[PDB]
Amino acid sequence: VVVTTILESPYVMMKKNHEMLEGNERYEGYCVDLAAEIAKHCGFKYKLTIVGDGKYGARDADTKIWNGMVGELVYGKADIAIAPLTITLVREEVID
Amino acid sequence: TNAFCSQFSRGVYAIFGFYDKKSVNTITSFCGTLHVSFITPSFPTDGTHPFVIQMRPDLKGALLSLIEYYQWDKFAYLYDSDRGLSTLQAVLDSAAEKKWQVTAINVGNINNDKKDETYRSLFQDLELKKERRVILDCERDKVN
Amino acid sequence: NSIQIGGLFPRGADQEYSAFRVGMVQFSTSEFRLTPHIDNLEVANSFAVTNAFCSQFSRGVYAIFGFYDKKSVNTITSFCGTLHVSFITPSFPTDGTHPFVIQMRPDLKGALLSLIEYYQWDKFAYLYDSDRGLSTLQAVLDSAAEKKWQVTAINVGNINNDKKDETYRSLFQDLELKKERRVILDCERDKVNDIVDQVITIGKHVKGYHYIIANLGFTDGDLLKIQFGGAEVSGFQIVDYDDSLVSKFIERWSTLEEKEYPGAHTATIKYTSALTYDAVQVMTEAFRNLRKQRIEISRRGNAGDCLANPAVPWGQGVEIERALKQVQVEGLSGNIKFDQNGKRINYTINIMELKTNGPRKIGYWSEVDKMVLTEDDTSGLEQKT
């Protein structure tokens, strides 16, 4: 189960030697140790991916596309997003 | 027509053969009036046709039951024309009463030469819309 | 000169066959005479369509005129493609290009895709008819992907003649819950009058609802009942009554007897009879051009079989079609000229909109120029700002 997130301090940050490590150990922060405390409760493997465009993402006015991290949850490129995702109305109707 | 009228001259009892969307209107008419039974594993007839027996099960009910399992409402539908369009009428009528946003795109008219460039123009049209889930409905040669 | 042709008119079709006699009378020539051999057989049973094709091919006719349906489109175009006998038709055009079958009826796909973009729609139902075919349904679904139209396509021609009230009423209550005001109904004159009468009874024709009768005959349907309600019923009309070649024909149409030409004592004409009357002109003009550039028209009419093993062509039949493609005349529908495939080109479809006067013209669709909105009276004349 892929935990996607965004690189914002102090939620997700790089460690001291991220080239020397791989996978989950390339990242640290608030949500990262929160991601483990979800995993110890629910029992699933995870791999942290960073959303590419660096936006939390909102619906475009004309094309009605989602970009950003909600664009990964709706369109299915990741399975869960432990990140500073602000609860709104336009984001409630597309992801829970 | 000639091969059916040929075997009508040999005095056969039952006729086994295939058909397509071109000749579905031929065999079901010839076997209806000449009262000769016909057995086929091709695509089944749409309305009830006399004297024509189908060995291939209908899947338009099972396709709707599969979609209502996965809880889909926004899916593209790449269909082939030459197989017939009876499945398309089922997933458009059921697109009404279950709130489905179907993007039904024909794909069967693509040639032998420029087939790779139009399919690149095809799936890019499902990237402006961002249709992830795609029902392919075509013969084995159009699947691969 | 004794030139014979063939007929494939359906059961119950009479106004098309009465308008075949009138074209035979007026477009006759003392130089060359057309001899019709007419069969009134069912157009749905492709076995009976096959038999009528062989019996007329046993006569040795040079070009067959007839109608076809979805249940026989792939029969006639397969025999005519192989036995090399040309075929004139006012029925629906085939989707794939078919040699040796000429089509008098104009295609309306680019007109219907122009009219929707003219009113700037985005969300509309589409009631289609299976017996008409699914050819236009492929056009407004493939083009729906490119321009984001939430098309709710619903089959309606499968509704049987016995129980039509409960099914049509259960149909429009579905379109009400999806809030589908804009409807493109698209079916023959049988199923336009049955949908419109169920629109009248349910009362889906107040101000706010919009319709597009996507037939080539817009005045051909009942129109007085839908008129005063306030529903903007647009549409398409192939023959225009003020062209002054048409209104000469309407006078000669109305002043015929009812018992001699059934369905002729009318004010209007069906759009099939308008292309049936035009098709005799094209068969005459091509046979006239076959006479001016003279060739061996005469064939030894002893084919007979139509089960020949193998069945062979005859090369003068290609010479006939090359004359049939080489036709540019004027008729009821307008400029009649063909391409190398067989569909018509440089034709013009009138976009008609329904106002309280009756049918009213706002524009014309064409091939070289998409949708020429005509001179406008600024239809509802605006208050001064």
Place this chain on the structure above:
Amino acid sequence: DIVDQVITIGKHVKGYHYIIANLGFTDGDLLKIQFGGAEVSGFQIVDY
């Protein structure tokens, strides 16, 4: 003649109300006004 001109104008959608103030309510044509959504009350003197 009034109901047929109500049908053609389309004054019989939901929102309009009618009272046929005759003693014969089923005596008139009633199937045409029925499905439109106009509440057509009335009076009937003989009960079937």
